[PDB]
């Protein structure tokens, strides 16, 4: 709005209807009253199964206290309980809620250090160039995509599990 | 994901966009993008070398192929299957790092596949060209494919690993792949450094 | 459109060099000279291959623990 940076990591700001005039029972967060609509997705009507514990934990209306809060992911729509991952309440304004299962934008390994702030994202044109030729010992510092300059090689499951096994066979002699 | 991903002519797909619902179809056929068929035909036409370790053998057999061709028996008793199979039994257990032996094994398979069709394109001199022609003539009497694995020795194997690195750069490929190729080349030459009896 | 892209979906056990196999007819051969300076079936195949290599890794692990003594 004012001219600030905003990638896909930031969530779209909430409109005032969901923000001020969102009734009294709803409130800013589902932290109050029984809200079974958050446990059922409108895409298929099934139940959002949490990733860590295989339970929806919808609970009961006669016993609301057995209900465990769940949230959908902003990238992969993966359900996650609020008690499994350490987190107090929901994520409604600010950056998009990144579940603790995705690749971090920047990681830290101490040997001073290297950041590796990802490689952003290139739109679908001639600059986005692909080359699969080698699977073993590529040393391509990550930034990959799975298939069945800013080059991204076509990496598959077999090569990833191969070079992972190769590296942990190198490192266990140490 | 993205903003343009359609099997047919793209219409900012994220179904025929910009049309009514009574036109949809989900049949399974061949799919080609072609950039909206070149934008509906432009809007309907507007309305590196080997190290110096044992390089004496190449100048040794360079002169010897002028009149002797380094082989005189058509069913040569020297063969490549045993010398390639011994790689997984002497050096992959000893010199290779702990882990996967693929960098030797699938190399062996790929180099066998390369030797299966390297004949007729380079690696050949006129008199053993005649020898290969007469071998093909005697191998065509039973309409069987010519296997060059049982009838060719390992004398041309190191000359093959000598000629390949210059043609490796003839195609578009990264540099650390060529580094892996020269690492395998130096590994092969330290393997054959003190194996002076087998040819 | 380039031919090699769909060539790797049926070729097996040839990984390091694949681009040079396409243009084997685009270059004519010549005589010898020397410079004066000098996926379902293939998927099962590679699973069986991987099984063989990790078994070989098990015997080489036994090999280093034997030769360490």
UniProtKB/Swiss-Prot annotation, chain B:
Domain of life: Eukaryota
Gene3D superfamilies: 2.30.30.140, MRG domain (1.10.274.30)
Domain MRG: start-end pairs: 48-199
Location of the protein in the cell: Nucleus
A Pfam family hit: MSL3_chromo-like
PROSITE patterns (UniProt xref): MRG
Family per similarity comment: Belongs to the MRG family.
Function: Component of the NuA4 histone acetyltransferase complex which is involved in transcriptional activation of selected genes principally by acetylation of nucleosomal histone H4 and H2A. The NuA4 complex is also involved in DNA repair.
Subunit details: Component of the NuA4 histone acetyltransferase complex composed of at least ACT1, ARP4, YAF9, VID21, SWC4, EAF3, EAF5, EAF6, EAF7, EPL1, ESA1, TRA1 and YNG2.
Note: Present with 1890 molecules/cell in log phase SD medium.
Protein name: Chromatin modification-related protein EAF3
Organism placement in taxonomy: Eukaryota, Fungi, Dikarya, Ascomycota, Saccharomycotina
Gene designation per UniProt: EAF3
Curated annotation (Swiss-Prot), chain C:
Further details from the record: Present with 486 molecules/cell in log phase SD medium.
Localisation: Nucleus
Name by which UniProt lists this protein: Transcriptional regulatory protein RCO1
Source species taxonomy: Eukaryota, Fungi, Dikarya, Ascomycota, Saccharomycotina
Name of the gene: RCO1
Organism expressing this protein natively: Saccharomyces cerevisiae (strain ATCC 204508 / S288c) (Baker's yeast)
UniProt subunit comment: Component of the RPD3C(S) complex composed of at least EAF3, RCO1, RPD3, SIN3, and UME1.
Residues of the whole record sequence present: 320 to 570 of 684
Protein task: Catalytic component of the RPD3C(S) histone deacetylase complex responsible for the deacetylation of lysine residues on the N-terminal part of the core histones (H2A, H2B, H3 and H4). Histone deacetylation gives a tag for epigenetic repression and plays an important role in transcriptional regulation, cell cycle progression, DNA damage response, osmotic stress response and developmental events.
């Amino acid at each position: 709005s004012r001219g600030q940076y905003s990638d896909e990591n930031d969530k779209i700001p909430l409109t005032d209807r969901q923000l001020f005039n969102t009734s009294y029972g709803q409130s800013i967060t589902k932290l109050d009253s029984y809200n079974p609509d958050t446990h059922i997705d409108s895409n298929s009507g099934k139940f959002l199964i949490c990733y860590k514990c295989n339970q929806t934990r919808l609970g009961s209306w006669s016993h609301p206290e057995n209900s465990r809060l769940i949230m959908t992911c902003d990238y992969c729509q993966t359900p996650w309980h609020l008690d499994c991952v350490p987190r107090a309440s929901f994520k409604n304004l600010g950056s998009k809620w990144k579940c603790p299962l995705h690749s971090p934008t920047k990681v830290y390994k101490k040997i001073n250090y290297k950041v590796w702030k990802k490689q952003r994202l290139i739109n679908k044109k001639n600059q986005l160039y692909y080359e699969p030729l080698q699977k073993i010992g590529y040393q391509n510092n990550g930034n990959i995509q799975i298939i069945p300059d800013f080059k991204i090689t076509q990496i598959d499951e077999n090569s990833i599990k191969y070079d992972f096994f190769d590296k942990i066979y190198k490192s266990k002699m140490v | 994901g993205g903003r343009c991903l359609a099997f047919h002519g793209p219409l900012m797909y994220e179904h025929y966009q910009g049309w009514k619902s009574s036109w949809d179809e989900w049949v399974g056929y061949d799919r080609i993008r072609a950039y909206n068929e070149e934008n509906i035909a432009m809007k309907k036409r507007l309305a590196l070398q080997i190290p110096i370790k044992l390089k004496s053998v190449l100048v040794d057999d360079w002169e010897y192929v002028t009149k002797d061709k380094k082989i005189c028996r058509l069913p040569a008793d020297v063969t490549v299957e045993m010398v390639l199979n011994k790689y997984e039994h002497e050096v992959s257990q000893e010199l290779e790092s702990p882990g996967s032996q693929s960098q030797l094994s699938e190399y062996c398979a790929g180099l066998k596949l390369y030797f299966d069709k390297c004949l007729g394109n380079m690696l050949l001199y006129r008199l053993e060209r005649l020898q290969y022609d007469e071998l093909l003539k005697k191998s065509s009497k039973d309409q069987k494919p010519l296997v060059p694995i049982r009838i060719y020795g390992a004398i041309h194997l190191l000359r093959l690993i000598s000629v390949l690195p210059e043609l490796i750069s003839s195609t578009t490929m990264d540099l650390q792949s060529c580094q892996l190729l020269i690492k395998q080349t130096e590994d092969f030459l330290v393997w054959l450094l003190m194996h002076v009896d087998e040819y | 459109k380039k031919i090699e892209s769909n060539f790797i979906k049926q070729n097996n056990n040839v990984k390091i060099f694949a681009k040079l196999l396409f243009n084997i007819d685009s270059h004519n051969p010549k005589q010898f000279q020397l410079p004066n300076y000098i996926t379902q079936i293939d998927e099962n195949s590679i699973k069986y291959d991987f099984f063989d290599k990790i078994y070989k890794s098990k015997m080489v692990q036994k090999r280093k623990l034997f030769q360490f003594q």
